From Swiss-Prot, chain A:
Protein name in UniProt: General transcription and DNA repair factor IIH subunit TFB2
Protein's organism: Saccharomyces cerevisiae (strain ATCC 204508 / S288c)
Listed GO CC annotations: nucleotide-excision repair factor 3 complex; transcription factor TFIIH core complex; transcription factor TFIIH holo complex
Family: Belongs to the TFB2 family.
Molecular functions per Gene Ontology: ATPase activator activity; double-stranded DNA binding
InterPro entries: Tfb2_C, TFIIH_p52/Tfb2
Main location: nucleus
Function: Component of the general transcription and DNA repair factor IIH (TFIIH) core complex, which is involved in general and transcription-coupled nucleotide excision repair (NER) of damaged DNA and, when complexed to TFIIK, in RNA transcription by RNA polymerase II. In NER, TFIIH acts by opening DNA around the lesion to allow the excision of the damaged oligonucleotide and its replacement by a new DNA fragment. In transcription, TFIIH has an essential role in transcription initiation.
Entry's Gene Ontology BP terms: nucleotide-excision repair; transcription by RNA polymerase II; transcription initiation at RNA polymerase II promoter
Miscellaneous section: Present with 8900 molecules/cell in log phase SD medium.
Self-association and partners: Component of the 7-subunit TFIIH core complex composed of XPB/SSL2, XPD/RAD3, SSL1, TFB1, TFB2, TFB4 and TFB5, which is active in NER. The core complex associates with the 3-subunit CTD-kinase module TFIIK composed of CCL1, KIN28 and TFB3 to form the 10-subunit holoenzyme (holo-TFIIH) active in transcription. An additionnal subunit, TFB6, plays a role in the dissociation of the SSL2 helicase from TFIIH after transcription initiation. Interacts with TFB5.
NCBIfam families named among the record's database cross-references: tfb2 (TIGR00625)
Curated annotation (Swiss-Prot), chain B:
Subunit structure: Component of the 7-subunit TFIIH core complex composed of XPB/SSL2, XPD/RAD3, SSL1, TFB1, TFB2, TFB4 and TFB5, which is active in NER. The core complex associates with the 3-subunit CTD-kinase module TFIIK composed of CCL1, KIN28 and TFB3 to form the 10-subunit holoenzyme (holo-TFIIH) active in transcription. An additionnal subunit, TFB6, plays a role in the dissociation of the SSL2 helicase from TFIIH after transcription initiation. Interacts with TFB2.
Organism: Saccharomyces cerevisiae (strain ATCC 204508 / S288c) (Baker's yeast)
GO cellular component: cytosol; nucleus; transcription factor TFIIH core complex; transcription factor TFIIH holo complex
UniProt KW keywords: DNA damage, DNA repair, Nucleus, Transcription, Transcription regulation
Biological role stated in the UniProt entry: Component of the general transcription and DNA repair factor IIH (TFIIH) core complex, which is involved in general and transcription-coupled nucleotide excision repair (NER) of damaged DNA and, when complexed to TFIIK, in RNA transcription by RNA polymerase II. In NER, TFIIH acts by opening DNA around the lesion to allow the excision of the damaged oligonucleotide and its replacement by a new DNA fragment. In transcription, TFIIH has an essential role in transcription initiation.
Single GO biological process annotation from the record: transcription by RNA polymerase II
Name the record gives this protein: General transcription and DNA repair factor IIH subunit TFB5
Gene behind this protein: TFB5
The keyword Thylakoid is assigned to this record: no
Subcellular localization: Nucleus
Swiss-Prot record, chain C:
Effect of pH on activity: Optimum pH is 7.25 for helicase and ATPase activities.
Result of knocking out the encoding gene: Essential, it cannot be deleted; epistasis studies suggest it is involved in damaged DNA excision repair.
Residue span, Helicase C-terminal domain: 457-611
Parent sequence residues shown: 101 to 766 of 843
GO molecular function annotations of the record: 3'-5' DNA helicase activity; ATP binding; ATP hydrolysis activity; DNA binding; DNA helicase activity; DNA translocase activity
Protein name per UniProt: General transcription and DNA repair factor IIH helicase/translocase subunit XPB/SSL2
Note: Present with 825 molecules/cell in log phase SD medium.
Assigned EC number: 5.6.2.4
GO-annotated biological processes: nucleotide-excision repair; poly(A)+ mRNA export from nucleus; regulation of mitotic recombination; RNA polymerase II promoter clearance; transcription by RNA polymerase II; transcription initiation at RNA polymerase II promoter; transcription open complex formation at RNA polymerase II promoter; transcriptional start site selection at RNA polymerase II promoter
UniProt KW Ribonucleoprotein keyword: no
Role summary: ATP-dependent DNA translocase. Component of the general transcription and DNA repair factor IIH (TFIIH) core complex. When complexed to CDK-activating kinase (CAK), involved in RNA transcription by RNA polymerase II. May have 3'-5' helicase activity alone, the TFIIH core however has no 3'-5' helicase activity. Also involved in transcription-coupled nucleotide excision repair (NER) of damaged DNA. In NER, TFIIH acts by opening DNA around the lesion to allow the excision of the damaged oligonucleotide and its replacement by a new DNA fragment.
Ranges of residues in domain Helicase ATP-binding: 241-403
Length: 460, 66, 634
């Protein structure tokens, strides 16, 4: 995940405040911050006076102060606040635009932008044009992955995928194949997929006539809630209207026909931030339509099915004959060696199977689960929750095709005494952050959490 | 604030030496060789290092699969 | 050929599509899902009659998959014959399967099931006056007997005679079906023609073996004592093979070395007629006799062992005999003792035959001696599902149908070899090994990647761990120099290449009984020439073993019954493999073979305290290279 939050903090402070002028956007990004920061912000919003940091430390007890660091580093990075070395102390307070916009949103503010929605006869049926939006999303997914016939006409969308290098396909030859980007597209189910696409549209649509403030206003207003009436009519900038038309082309806007009406709030914009239910000529069975099979025997057990979905499954397993409920496919080391040819890491697939194909493995994941977490301390043996036998086989295949071991972090030094190194190592073992250590060399290549906590302890 | 970034490489010393040879063949992009079990490299050329490693292993072993 | 291909016809009926194949309406409400085109049976947890459905499927077919959620179905011609002989109603079984299985019943599968229900294992072979005739209790059997070229044309119109049934039983049809029905007597010439017609027109007849009606054969010097050991699979196989009343010649695949010949001895005593016994080789014949037949009720006083080198009492043995394929019919006829044994075998109508591992020996000699001896019944104690002797005339229809399958998942987990865990430890690579890899591409690299000192370090850690657990360790190491070097390094009593038999027995005693020594290195000299010791921890080093089927035979034999359950995995399998070597491909082949076998498998390369083991001799890659120089001499 490119973690759009990182993109959010990427933009400078003045434009951040530009965005914070739009209260609905303020709320939508409030939805994203880690819970610690959420609570702290909600605290600060009302008492119209800065607050020293010491209190905001003593608020949080131990075993969790790491979340304290997470929150403060995030918020400082995106500069929602302004730390103030007023008297040499720390006088925290938010970007006042943020505070006023948020407080307005909570109690009937003047955010005409967030209130851009119009209430009228929303004759839009649930299935009504919802099926059309789902079909458009499926069509673009298949065309990008590459179907037998890809009717994807998103010339702008195709240009975004190509120039963005969405998938390792030869767009010069018209190929839309799975690259590392293509593999990720195969990985990020909905929020991941929609998010990567939104970021791509951002990067490509960033040169001229952007009005990024209006861009995000439009995006989140789409994600905020059903604007309905007068949306496409009134509630949009000129470039805002163009971007809205483009998004509606991209599926993410379920605008009706006639090319002039209120905003058509497709479920997709909801799907942008919901992290919830994923379900979308006129036939759509109401059930976990996802269909596949993955168990200890390393085989496909598909009774339910979905064409692009089963094709995704095939992207790492052989196909011989599609059947009525089943498709001929058996998952083996060679099956994943097919994707290893693309070099796709056996990482996204793990959580994918834990999440996707569960519409056909509900009972499987339940019997694996068995609520063996509260029962874990009593019965020390977990009952194959998130099957680790297959996990071991997959890891074995990955190593066999891998032959290389890598680690993240940075080299560390200036461990002058063995006492500090040993205490830091013990602390890291307590927190499980030390990949490897040695007092003889006083060096290692791990995450920065232990150094951060020791530095915070020393300085304050 | 001391933190030395780069493509850390950790493997067996034999493969370490082989990778050092390969890297020297491609103009020695290895930033550092921390010890017999760790190397610090610039990530820019690690990909072509892996590519040439694949090329030479295919040349030598050829995978008879007999 | 005198045998029908349908006995070994298993392996088909797995293919389908989605356009022509329609969604089974029972798929909406179907506790199981019998995939007909694939031959599968996806019996999910929604099936409430899962036990009965699994029993029916195992009867008719072979259930390949038994997952926690749903099961799997596989097609087996021998399994089809077993299901037909099961006796369940074909139409009722089809209806029950259609109800439980969500998928609709396929046309071809339904037709096969209907044919197997009546025709399969349900042929009619009448008998008059306690003999073999051309008739049937059902109407179909009588029509087939009347229209049979040998049953009818070679069968006298007389309905039945006591004397003809006893003597002539178109030969003595002791392998006929149930008697005392509408039938007519048959002559005493050409049962070969009758069985050839039955297999050619695909007539699986529910044969019996009326030993008491074998009036020509006097009751041989048989001591009918069942005091030999009896095992659950053994007794159930006996129940299947004895059929109803009189016994019958049949084929049953059994775990060799796990008391395979015990059931054969019991049946041979049961018939109380002329019987002979065959094991793989004459040396193996003696080994099997010594290891069990005196523990068994058999007295070797009558069972003369013939080799064409081991001259024994032929044509004078008062009781049953034990012979071997090499002596019976092979180029290893070093003396005319074998020829005289065959002449005596022709002279006496040996009413039954015991066979052990006939797959190695070509079926040509088997058919030659079948025609030469003109016996009453036989027996196949098979070891492999698919064998080189599955020719046009199948040895099944040459002997009899299948009755029991050596279900190793059932045997090696109930307590015999319970808790079989397998692993493939990847011995870390070193510079010298890959230098040798680049040097040459011949097959001399076997011992070159075998010798890895880290392999011995892992072996020593396993030894000390099993000593701590009080376990038993078996090692497969056919090498000589490297094996002796490792044995010197560990400094404990050890089995090795061409280990003396008395020394091997002493080490086996001190290994399975005493816990001071618990690791034995079995080479390629023993295997099919020595006594298989209890398997608790198996280590494999070499992985050549010809090309194939040697892996299967080694898995069947080296892994023997171990009545120990202290360890959570009472049967460790280990394959110490030098990683990044030539035999990585073949170690993966072994892994695939094992996962096909269904045994629990893993890989433990994160050895706990791998370098913490004592005696880190040759640990350095310099000494690895020196040992590589040593092996280059080998």
């Amino acid at each position: 995940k490119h973690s759009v939050t990182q993109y959010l903090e990427e933009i400078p402070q003045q434009v951040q405040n530009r965005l914070y002028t739009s209260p609905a956007t303020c709320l939508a990004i409030y939805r994203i911050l880690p819970p610690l920061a959420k609570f702290f912000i909600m605290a600060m919003v009302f008492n119209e006076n800065e607050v020293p940091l010491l209190d905001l430390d003593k608020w949080v007890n131990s075993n969790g102060k790491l979340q304290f660091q997470n929150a403060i580093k995030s918020m400082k990075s995106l500069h929602l606040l302004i730390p103030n070395k007023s008297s040499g102390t720390l006088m925290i307070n938010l970007n006042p635009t943020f505070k006023i916009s948020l407080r307005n949103a909570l109690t009937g503010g003047e955010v005409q932008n967030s209130f851009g929605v119009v209430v009228e006869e929303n004759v839009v049926s649930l299935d009504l044009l919802d099926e059309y939006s789902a079909n458009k999303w499926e069509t673009i997914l298949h065309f990008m992955v590459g179907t037998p016939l890809a009717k994807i006409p998103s010339e702008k969308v195709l240009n975004l995928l190509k120039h963005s290098k969405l998938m390792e396909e030869v767009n010069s030859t018209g190929e839309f194949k799975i690259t590392n980007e293509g593999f990720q597209f195969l990985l990020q189910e909905i929020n991941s997929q929609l998010w990567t696409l939104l970021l791509q549209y951002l990067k490509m649509i960033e040169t001229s006539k952007m009005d990024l403030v209006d861009v995000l206003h439009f995006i989140f207003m789409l994600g905020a809630l059903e604007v309905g009436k007068a949306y496409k009519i009134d509630a949009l900038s000129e470039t805002q209207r163009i971007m809205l038309q483009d998004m509606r082309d991209y599926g993410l806007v379920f605008q009706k026909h006639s090319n002039d009406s209120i905003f058509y709030p497709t479920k997709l914009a909801l799907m942008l931030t919901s992290d919830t239910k994923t379900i979308r000529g006129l036939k759509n069975q109401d059930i976990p339509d996802g269909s596949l099979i993955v168990e200890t025997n390393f085989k496909i057990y598909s009774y339910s099915n979905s064409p692009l979905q089963i094709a995704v499954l095939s992207l790492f397993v052989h196909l011989k004959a599609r059947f009525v409920n089943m498709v001929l496919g058996q998952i083996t080391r060679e099956s994943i060696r097919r994707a290893l040819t693309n070099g796709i890491t056996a990482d996204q697939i793990i959580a994918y199977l834990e999440t996707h194909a569960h519409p056909q493995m509900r009972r499987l994941a339940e019997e694996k689960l068995e609520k063996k977490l509260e029962l874990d301390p009593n019965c020390k043996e977990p009952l194959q929750v998130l099957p680790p036998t297959v996990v071991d086989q997959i890891r074995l295949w990955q190593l066999e095709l891998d032959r290389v071991i890598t680690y993240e972090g940075s080299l560390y030094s200036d461990f002058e005494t063995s006492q500090e190194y040993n205490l830091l190592s013990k602390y890291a073992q307590d927190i499980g952050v030390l990949l490897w250590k040695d007092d003889k060399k006083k060096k290692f290549f791990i995450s920065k959490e232990g150094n951060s906590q020791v530095l915070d302890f020393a300085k304050r | 604030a001391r933190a030395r970034k780069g493509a850390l490489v950790q493997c067996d010393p034999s493969i370490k030496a082989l990778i050092l040879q390969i890297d020297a063949k491609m103009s020695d992009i290895v930033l550092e060789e921390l010890d017999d079990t760790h190397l610090l490299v610039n990530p820019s050329k690690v990909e072509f290092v892996k590519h040439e490693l694949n090329r030479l292993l295919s040349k030598n072993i050829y995978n008879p699969m007999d | 050929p005198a045998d029908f291909v349908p006995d070994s016809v298993s392996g088909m009926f797995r293919s389908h599509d989605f356009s022509y194949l329609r969604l089974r309406p029972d798929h909406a409400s179907r506790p199981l899902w019998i995939s007909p085109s694939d031959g599968r049976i996806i019996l999910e947890s929604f099936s409430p009659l899962a036990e009965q459905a699994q029993d029916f499927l195992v009867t008719i077919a072979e259930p390949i998959s038994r997952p926690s959620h749903i099961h799997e179905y596989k097609i087996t011609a021998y399994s089809l014959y077993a299901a037909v002989s099961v006796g369940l109603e074909t139409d009722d079984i089809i209806s029950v399967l259609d109800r439980l299985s969500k998928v609709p019943v396929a046309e071809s599968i339904i037709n096969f099931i209907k044919g197997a229900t009546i025709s399969y294992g349900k042929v009619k072979l009448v008998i008059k006056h306690n003999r073999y005739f051309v008739e049937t209790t059902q109407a179909d059997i009588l029509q087939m007997l009347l229209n049979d070229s040998v049953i009818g044309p070679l069968r006298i119109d007389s309905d039945h005679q006591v004397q003809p049934p006893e003597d002539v039983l178109e030969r003595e049809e002791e392998d006929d079906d149930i008697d005392a029905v509408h039938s007519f007597e048959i002559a005493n010439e050409s049962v070969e023609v009758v069985k050839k017609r039955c297999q050619e027109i695909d007539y699986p007849v529910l044969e019996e073996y009326d030993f008491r009606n074998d009036h020509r054969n006097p009751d041989l010097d048989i001591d009918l004592k069942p005091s030999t050991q009896i095992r659950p699979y053994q007794e159930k196989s006996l129940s299947k093979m004895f059929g109803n009343g009189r016994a019958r010649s049949g084929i049953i695949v059994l775990p060799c070395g796990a008391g395979k010949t015990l059931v054969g001895i019991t049946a041979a005593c049961t018939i109380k007629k002329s019987v002979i016994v065959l094991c793989t080789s004459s040396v193996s014949v003696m080994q099997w006799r010594q290891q069990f037949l005196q523990w068994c009720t058999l007295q070797p006083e009558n069972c003369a062992v013939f080799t064409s080198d081991n001259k024994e009492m032929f044509q004078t043995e008062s009781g049953l005999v034990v012979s071997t394929y090499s002596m019976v019919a092979n180029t290893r006829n070093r003396s005319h003792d074998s020829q005289k044994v065959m002449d005596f075998l022709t002279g006496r109508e040996w009413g039954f035959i015991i066979l052990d591992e006939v797959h190695v020996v070509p079926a040509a000699m088997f058919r030659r001696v079948v025609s030469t001896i003109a016996a009453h019944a036989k027996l196949g104690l098979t070891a492999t599902l698919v064998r080189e002797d599955d020719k046009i005339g199948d040895l099944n229809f040459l002997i009899g149908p299948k009755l029991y399958e050596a279900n190793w998942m059932e045997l090696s987990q109930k307590g015999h070899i319970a808790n079989v865990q397998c692993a493939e430890v990847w011995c870390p690579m070193t510079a010298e090994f890959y230098q040798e890899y680049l040097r040459e591409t011949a097959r001399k690299r076997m011992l070159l990647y075998i010798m890895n000192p880290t392999k011995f370090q892992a072996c020593q850690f396993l030894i000390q761990y099993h000593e701590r657990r009080g376990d038993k360790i078996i090692v497969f190491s056919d090498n000589v120099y490297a094996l002796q070097e490792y044995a010197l390094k560990m400094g404990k009593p050890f089995i090795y290449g061409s280990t003396p038999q008395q020394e091997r027995m002493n080490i086996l005693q001190n290994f399975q009984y005493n816990d001071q020594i618990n690791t034995i290195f079995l080479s390629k000299v023993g295997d099919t020439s020595i006594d298989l010791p209890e398997a608790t921890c198996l280590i494999q080093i070499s992985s050549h073993y010809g090309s194939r089927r040697q892996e299967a035979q080694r898995l069947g034999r080296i892994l023997r019954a171990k009545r120990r359950n202290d360890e959570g995995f009472n049967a460790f399998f280990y394959s110490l493999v030098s990683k990044d070597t030539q035999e990585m491909y073949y170690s993966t082949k072994r892994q695939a073979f094992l996962v096909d076998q269904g045994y629990a498998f893993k890989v433990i390369t994160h050895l706990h305290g791998m370098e913490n083991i004592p005696n880190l001799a040759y640990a350095s890659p310099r000494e690895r290279r020196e040992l590589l120089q040593e092996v280059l001499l080998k």
